[PDB]
Design a protein around this ligand. Structure first.
Ligand SMILES: NC(=O)C1=CN([C@@H]2O[C@H](COP(=O)(O)OP(=O)(O)OC[C@H]3O[C@@H](n4cnc5c(N)ncnc54)[C@H](OP(=O)(O)O)[C@@H]3O)[C@@H](O)[C@H]2O)C=CC1
Ligand SMILES: [K+]
Ligand SMILES: [K+]
Ligand SMILES: [K+]
Ligand SMILES: [K+]
Ligand SMILES: [K+]
Ligand SMILES: [K+]
Ligand SMILES: [K+]
Ligand SMILES: [K+]
Lengths: 489, 489, 489, 489
């Protein structure tokens, strides 16, 4: 293995698991085994929780500004170690260094930096009832919470979940994807170095079926925050609910629509469509994988998309000139190729890619070509199902209401966007689209200030923005009676 | 039966169920059959959902102030029919006329009145990102929601659930408990009379063994609001989660602690304890059923409690002088007596009552005497488990930290209260008590402005207050890009 | 006179002034004497303050929902008497019935209705400092506040000032314009009938020089809210400041820019421009009296404006078909005619109107034709100075940045608007315009939810919206120390 | 002089004034000249305003987080240089090193640190009106604002005013008291070093009569924030109003009541009373200078206060062991000595101090002994008028309501405090006290989170907290019309 065996992180330090079992993480660029990683046992989970319990007491006992200064220090360390964390993330995900150096840690730390500044602003309410009585509310920490991470943006997700949790005075136990465990451990180190009390951010590695489930079931954990497929999200939420009525946050899948209206600049529209489909090799939940184009612009639009896709620079993620890397794993590559086959079988016209890239050294990695399908139909498998790979489906429409009805016609509802120059149409259309994340004349930007999450089966709750920080506290109302008490008895 | 057969309420009128089944509702004061009530079929749930979907569109297309005025009109009618509705609730619940006339509809209407005033204040946010881009959020209705009521406060709960839901522009399908179906049907008539559009408040009758489940599982229902026992709640929330990832609010059970500190006025403390245990014959979720008294004061406090309990006026709920009625149902009485038996069996000292009242006309009702146990211990069943009847457990303690530690030692966390004249101790203690509803020197008052709900397994989410209104909307974030768009490809 | 002598309104009824003096209010349509009106003396002011102080105590002692219900009852009476009140406002202002029946009372009552609903939502904050200390804030009533009104929307202004004041638990002493005293007194009657305690809304008539100033100087009045000209506002604000440091709201004049961009529909642009100049005979503070048109569209725009202006129905305000009435007074007409003369003398090109209309019955009143000057320049008197009459100035520009720079080149800053179909231009332009009230593709609408007020010399503070309610309370911060106090001594 | 001649700070550097005039700043501990300081001319004000206009544009064009980082860096520098800055403040004010090292910069930086974290959280609102129209508000910077400082807490005031101003994206021109100009200039250096753009924080030195007034009058300055005496505040506010209608914040004087109730611990009470009267040698605006003691406790309270005052360590502010320094200036000492004479003359009983301390080296400084008057009456000059020196007035009362009535019997209303162990009394009394800053069982703590300012003639607006940040912005409302526009013409 390229690295030494990875251990659990409990109580401000690495500790041995008690499972006697490990798993491997695999560089998707070349098949290389990067490291063996220990599997948390059930008792290791018990251990993490007890550690989390005592750590949270220390963390919550500090002042708001003390917590804020510690989180800001972590932000500083993240900025310093940006390029080094990125390089690790690139080995572990296959994502191009050009992305990991500029997006993953930068935007992960952005959210942490945002919340660090907001600790002192968490406030309750005061309500006068009458001269002899009033109420005040407190926003108290939940206590111990758990985050279960996804494999497309491992460290960013760990940051987006842990930042609000810690800022609100909680301790978090985090479980990275078994697929991408490496950077989460590094984040734990950084928190500890920043001054976060032992136990406040612990990392447990292992599978979702086991340690993931052991966390969602644990009676001492107060909330679960999950990021993954909708199918898994349902199991996780039910488990969290039926075990001990935990609060939950679910960021799940989508099949998000992008509608190009007939007055759009086609150069901008194509730039948006390719970004909404091919960044991180198509492994972004909010991707605009259903692209609606008006009949009158279909030929020009396809030509413009084609031209951009052709010049995509697929290659070794270590090469700074690469802007399109392999997929995250070989099994995931197989999944994508199956969907691609589905599209061919169902008679969608293949415009670009549509197969594995095996030339030379690429055969050793999980490379799928940037693929565009056109002449698609709403009932095709590639159009209904989330592919989570580099697969664009182009759908022609004739009028606005049709485009909107079709965009909305899905059980998903994470993101949606429109391209248009007309003031009234932009707002009108976005107001009718059933998604939590809506973009006008852009795609993919997710400011720390902007609450993001899904409508329908694409999620529950939100991340980022002031509202997310509020939902990592619980409300206690205190009624103070200053006068008499009357009893009917 | 006293009344005609009760039908379903869908689309602004009564319609015939399609189940071929009915169930009875019984006056618990005398075993009289009040009415046969039709059971919704699964196809009837579907019919109520489609009706709600169409109604919600009409409702949400009105202006905020139009919705506000309509809800304000429903409040006026409720004020007019307070006594008439109270009488009907008394028949159905066995609760004394003295209670239903001054609490149930009054405080139900209080909350509707409160939310009616707030419809025009539901706002989103606007966030500048830079000169060429900003975001704004919309707080959009969820759409169709379901409420599931409990049997202790049927109409009040229907109001507490439907008011925020409708205020926020949703339609609600409501299922009263099969034990108390009558007043919810009246509420539906009233909304229609006030101008609420057809389909916006539909009522489905049945039980948790069917229609309840059909509601929590329906794919087109976006949120479940549930009030009931913790054990049922866990089931409900799991079904709500796994079926279609619904949002949920759960108001569940409690074993709420009332700590009487040594400096307390024992007359007030006694008053608070009796109110916290015997109002609505002990059928209040937030009841203070574990009463901690300091050892130095145990003798004195037990005498003051005894004196009040002795003069409780148990009797026919129809008599205005009655302030303690029978229980809601005979099966519920059996459950309660079971617990009282447990108390005796585990050697707690019976101070008061402890049996069914069967003298004269009472033998035909479900009357359980006001019961007080003392010399209790934390491992007794009557102390760990919610009884939801007239059973107070008095527990001796020695120091402040011990009382609080014990008060907190429960999976429950609905309410908690302290009685004390000391400024510091009142706040110090209340801040350390793990409950969502905290009372200082009083008990049971639940203003429309005060968010209420449980910590731990006593609930998820809140009812009443500003925050609850927000939780009947979903957030959509809109990013408007006014400048250039940059692609890496 | 048409009506009996109008007396002061103090403490829930009419009382004789103690000045020995009166003035007359005149119908501007025909010069008819509507009423003798009493002038409040200095002692009457003192009487109204003492009344207000006592009434405020009763008002604030009520609960939030009690106040809310009384204000709602006032709304109901206003809706009932809309037409009768409009008729009176038309007599007093000369504004067409078609306007007074549908705008003045409707939108005045809209704002009262909005705030009535919000009374229970006024809340302070709670902030934990450490385990042994926290703070909570109270938003307490200011106490007694004064409103000074203007003559163009007399009752609407009285409502827009008294609604938030009373909703926040204050008492208001209101001084309507000497020019238009009649409807303010009716409002005071209506408040009383709705159940507003005696003293809570008192009305003093007289001049600004005397009674207005006595109000702004009185040591027991905590806030002044004024609507009028910028020049007068400076005096009033200085006086409120130096006397006793009162809080202030100032709604003043403007010279608001309307920018029509080259991609605008010119029919919509012309509709907007005429509505923004000729409603209430040009006597609206937020009027868009500087209208910027691109050089390439000048001729077509003028033709469209001219076509609409030609069909304006100047006439007797009592006639329902009239949509353009006389000005409020003969002296105000003289002022407006002076500006019109200035425009001719400085060589602006007269497109429409530009003179008094004296034909037939119009000679009895103060009627100025709707007037349009074009080929204007920035340095012209009519372009620099608020005219407050029916005088539109059309200005030609060549580029967007030029238009915006010129629109901002003024000491005023009340309103601004753009007409454009382009998404990016609409927001970009509005964001750069230095005014508090900004309209895109519309003009003049002022929803109860929307904070309105001026930038620069056009105002201080705001009216309407959530923010305004807050500004009629004062913040008290309360720190509770629960632990030890330390002294350096 | 001890230091070189101090110049103006404009555009991120020192520049020569153009008045040709200087003034001296004097160490009050020994009468020695610390520095000659330049007087800004009228043209220097203009220069500073132009500098600020251009600076503000650079500042506002950065992103929220960029501003946040810059201010956080300033905080870091201020922490590094705490002792050095404290030493300069001690020279300039005469305040003990023990105070300045732990209070002045510490709490100045706290507030800056607080606001730096809140920059990204400044948001507007979004309000839907109907399907075809919505509004959003923007909270835009005011632009250029001016702060005018007092002499008791020079650098802390400069920080409390500049922090929210800059955090909200404004440029501030600041004018320190002529009495204490030194630390403000240092602050400007630190802001520049931290990366604040040139012009964003400019410092002009001179007299309030001249430069101060030139700032309140300048047409381009949008807001004045002032701290000082009520009498001066009125003139400043009048000038800011009549010149260009500026927005204002005024933090003025007071005669704040401290009410010791009979159940209070007299040791704590005495500790609080002395701290509320003798910290910073009595030069604290919020000082509890009227101390109310129940008659039954007068003798004992006097004893306890006497014992504490006698051990007060008056001496050289350079001595770490000194905790009571000289007054800020010789003319100020003279004023205080006058008030003390008045006290003696009006027959209040002198319990302590009551004269200048001239022993040894003290005769070269402006030392007044800690002074306690008892047997005071409400009509005594020392009880009615703010002394702003080390003079406590003890007042006896017989009942709660009398004490509260007398506490409120003043045109002032800055602070108030009660001492009591009773829950009800604590909150009940404080809710009835007419002051903006209320303390229970403590005094003097002013956390960044807590809004502080005066009722009545003690102030306008507030500083710190979340509310203050809002008030360094102006609200712009934007209505977007997406549908048709209707004209009556
Ligand atoms: N990055 C983004 O923008 C968004 C990504 N998405 C989604 O995530 C997906 C990709 O992940 P996918 O391969 O489907 O894996 P899953 O969605 O099944 O897993 C997500 C996480 O949950 C864990 N998990 C799996 N089963 C359970 C369980 N039964 N109980 C508790 N935890 C469990 C997994 O652990 P392990 O895999 O280690 O066993 C993994 O850490 C896509 O659906 C994508 O839409 C969703 C949210 C954010
Ligand atoms: K990997
Ligand atoms: K959902
Ligand atoms: K029943
Ligand atoms: K819970
Ligand atoms: K008139
Ligand atoms: K202004
Ligand atoms: K000095
Ligand atoms: K004031």
């Amino acid at each position: 293995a390229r690295f030494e065996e990875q251990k659990l992180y409990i109580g401000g330090r690495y500790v041995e698991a008690s499972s006697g079992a490990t798993f491997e993480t695999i560089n998707p660029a070349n098949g290389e085994v990067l490291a063996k990683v220990q599997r948390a046992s059930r008792e290791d989970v018990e251990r993490a929780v007890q550690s989390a319990v005592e750590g949270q007491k220390v963390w919550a006992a500090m002042t708001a500004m003390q917590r804020s200064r510690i989180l800001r220090r972590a932000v500083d360390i993240l900025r310093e170690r940006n390029d080094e964390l990125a390089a690790l993330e690139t080995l572990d995900t296959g994502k191009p260094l050009a992305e990991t150096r500029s997006v993953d840690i930068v935007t992960g730390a952005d959210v942490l930096e945002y919340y660090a500044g907001l600790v002192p602003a968490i406030e309750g309410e005061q309500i006068p009832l009458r001269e002899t009585s009033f109420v005040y509310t407190r926003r108290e920490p939940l206590g111990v919470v758990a985050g279960i991470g996804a494999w497309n943006y491992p460290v960013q997700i760990a940051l987006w979940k842990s930042a609000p949790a810690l800022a609100a005075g909680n301790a978090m136990i985090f479980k990275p994807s078994e697929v991408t465990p490496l950077t989460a451990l590094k984040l734990a180190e950084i928190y500890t170095e920043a001054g976060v009390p032992d136990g406040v951010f612990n990392v447990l590695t292992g599978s979702g079926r086991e340690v993931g489930q052991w966390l969602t079931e644990h009676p001492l954990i107060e909330k679960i925050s999950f990021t993954g497929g909708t199918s898994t999200g349902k199991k996780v939420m039910a488990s969290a609910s039926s075990s001990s009525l935990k609060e939950v946050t679910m960021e799940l899948g989508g099949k998000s629509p992008l509608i190009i209206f007939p007055d759009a600049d086609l150069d901008r529209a194509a730039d948006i469509a390719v970004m909404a489909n091919f960044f991180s090799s198509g492994q972004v939940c909010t991707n605009g994988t259903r692209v609606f184009i008006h009949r009158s612009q279909q030929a020009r639009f396809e030509a413009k998309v084609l031209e951009r896709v052709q010049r995509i620079r697929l290659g070794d993620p270590q090469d700074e000139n690469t802007n399109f890397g392999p997929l995250v794993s070989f099994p995931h590559m197989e999944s994508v190729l199956g969907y691609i086959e589905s599209g061919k079988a169902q008679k969608a016209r293949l415009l670009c890619g549509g197969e594995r890239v095996t030339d030379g050294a690429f055969g050793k990695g999980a490379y799928v070509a940037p693929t565009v399908f056109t002449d698609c139909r709403d009932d095709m498998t590639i159009v209904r199902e989330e592919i989570f790979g580099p697969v664009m489906s182009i759908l022609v429409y004739d009028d606005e209401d049709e485009a909107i009805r079709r965009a909305n016609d899905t059980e998903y509802g994470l993101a949606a966007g429109v391209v248009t120059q007309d003031l009234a149409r932009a707002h009108r259309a976005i107001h009718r689209l059933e998604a939590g994340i809506c973009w006008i004349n852009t795609w993919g930007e997710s400011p720390a200030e902007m609450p993001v999450g899904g409508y329908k089966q694409s999620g529950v709750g939100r991340e980022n923005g002031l509202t997310t920080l509020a939902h990592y506290t619980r409300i206690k109302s205190v009624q103070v009676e200053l006068g008499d008490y009357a009893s009917v008895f």
